Amino acid sequence: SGPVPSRARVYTDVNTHRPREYWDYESHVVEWGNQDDYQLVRKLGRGKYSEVFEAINITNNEKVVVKILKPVKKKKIKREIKILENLRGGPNIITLADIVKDPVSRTPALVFEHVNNTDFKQLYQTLTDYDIRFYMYEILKALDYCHSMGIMHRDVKPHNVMIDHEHRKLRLIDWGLAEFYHPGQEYNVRVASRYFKGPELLVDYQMYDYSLDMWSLGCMLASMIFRKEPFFHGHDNYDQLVRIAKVLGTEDLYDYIDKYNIELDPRFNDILGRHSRKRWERFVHSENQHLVSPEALDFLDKLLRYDHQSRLTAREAMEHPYFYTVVKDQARM
Ligand SMILES: CC(C)n1c2c(c3c1-c1c(Br)c(Br)c(Br)c(Br)c1C3=O)C(=O)CCC2
């Protein structure tokens, strides 16, 4: 009788307990700023849905960053703006300063407070063991905060983390795919980038939750501690799950599919075949030796679980021994 329903283990009713205006972004009326307050200085980069510029607010002569959006539905613009406004001030969350429209073309643009143009993906393959732990913990702070505010990021990956390494500061960016979690709601499976998609997306299970982000985080952790970019290198959507199964084994995949009564495609079953689980230790080499510890492998094993309900929450992750010294060093700084 169709897929079994699912609920988030933590922060389940966070949005129910808030006023409707908190999460009803379609009803929200956007109050647009003045684009004439901002002059673009130079280009910083670009994405599938935006172009990113360094800019100056000439009313206060403050440096800012402007993300000019490509054409998308008004609903999605309103969603991203509401989410960013709701998370403003959160630990390690980018800070929206303004929203403007071009006077002529009416093209919308988001204005953020400035941070260092250093992408985590440019640094995370050369980190010390302790730096991997430290920056993982800072990402977790962002994820626990946004989940506690009822929001799933849904595009966690190295490219969406910015690092100011001199100040050991970190920001989670690119909230264009983020959504509010509501229990019982079915969500689009066309989220996250292929190498970071959780099994729930790859089997088209729509009643997912914050734990999607925890899978993506595990994929980042594995890539860093084994120096394999990406760790699960699928060449199409079905191959992404084949590659996962060649590591986690097919037994726990079929148990997951049965648990939620997921109806897989007949010959997707044949494609998956049968694969034994590999021990995590099998991906360690002489080069990454100093980055792999018992606690790292236990932590990774507890993030990369097929059953989304079995993965560590962000707070459970932050209390894992892998961060023990990290936590003690955060109390003295
Ligand atoms: C990697 C860089 C070019 N970049 C990208 C994005 C964003 C940035 C970026 C930078 Br740099 C800075 Br500084 C700030 Br502040 C902010 Br906000 C952003 C931001 O949102 C995307 O959203 C997707 C495409 C790549």
Domain ranges of the chain: 6-23+115-330, 24-114
Question: According to the annotation, is 67 in a ligand binding site?
Answer: yes
115 Cβ below 6 A of ligand 1 = yes
The first and second tokens of residue 304, run together, are: 């990369």
Classify 277 as helix, strand or coil: coil
Give 158's DSSP letter: G
Question: Strands 62-69 and 50-57, how do they pair?
Answer: antiparallel
Distance 119 CA to ligand 1 centre (A): 9
Nearest Cα to 187, choosing from 10, 63, 6? 6
Distance CA 264, CA 282 (A): 29
Distance CA 66, CA 125 (A): 28
Tell me how the structure was determined: X-ray
Question: According to the annotation, is 50 in a ligand binding site?
Answer: yes
Distance CA 154, CA 179 (A): 8
Beta bridge partners of 53: 43, 66
> Which residue puts its alpha carbon closest to atom 8 of ligand 1?
52
Give 153's DSSP letter: -
Q: What's the residue count for the chain?
A: 333
φ and ψ of 68, to 5 deg? -90, 120
The residues, ordered by sequence, that sit 6+ positions from 57 with a Cβ below 8 Å of its Cβ are: 37, 38, 63, 64, 97, 111
Q: What is the CB neighbour count within 10 angstroms for residue 2?
A: 8
Distance CA 172, CA 97 (A): 16
φ and ψ of 49, to 5 deg? -125, 10
65 Cβ below 6 A of ligand 1 = yes
Residue with tokens 């892998």: 322
- Over its C-alpha atoms, the chain yields an Rg (Å, rounded) of 20
Amino acid at position 276, single letter:
S
Q: Judge whether 115 and 171 are in contact, CB under 8 Å.
A: yes
Give me the sign of the Cα torsion angle 144, 149, 152, 157.
negative
- Alpha helices by DSSP H, listed for the chain, are 20-23, 74-87, 129-148, 199-202, 211-226, 237-248, 251-259, 266-272, 294-303, 314-318, 324-331
Question: According to the annotation, is 51 in a ligand binding site?
Answer: yes
Distance 148 CA to ligand 1 centre (A): 24
Residue 155 annotated as catalytic: yes
Closest ligand 1 atom to Cα of 118: 11
Q: Which fold would CATH assign to domain 6-23+115-330?
A: Transferase(Phosphotransferase); domain 1 (1.10.510)
Q: What is the CB neighbour count within 10 angstroms for residue 129?
A: 15
Distance 65 CA to ligand 1 centre (A): 8
Nearest Cα to 309, choosing from 214, 188, 217, 196? 214
The residues, ordered by sequence, that sit 6+ positions from 133 with a Cβ below 8 Å of its Cβ are: 322, 323, 325, 326
Amino acid at position 139, single letter:
I
69's enclosing H/E stretch is strand 62-69
Nearest Cα to 3, choosing from 215, 268, 241, 206? 206
The first and second tokens of residue 288, run together, are: 């990454």
Distance CA 82, CA 140 (A): 22
Classify 50 as helix, strand or coil: strand
Question: According to the annotation, is 84 in a ligand binding site?
Answer: no
Q: Judge whether 232 and 201 are in contact, CB under 8 Å.
A: no
φ and ψ of 53, to 5 deg? -130, 145
Virtual torsion, Cα 291, 297, 300, 305, nearest 10 deg? 150
Distance CA 93, CA 142 (A): 6
Give me the sign of the Cα torsion angle 23, 313, 285, 290.
positive
Amino acid at position 125, single letter:
Q
Which is catalytic among the residues 155, 174, 209, 213? Answer: 155
Q: What is the CB neighbour count within 10 angstroms for residue 166?
A: 8
Question: Strands 50-57 and 96-101, how do they pair?
Answer: unpaired
Q: Which fold would CATH assign to domain 24-114?
A: Phosphorylase Kinase; domain 1 (3.30.200)
> Which residue puts its alpha carbon closest to atom 22 of ligand 1?
174
Give 42's DSSP letter: E
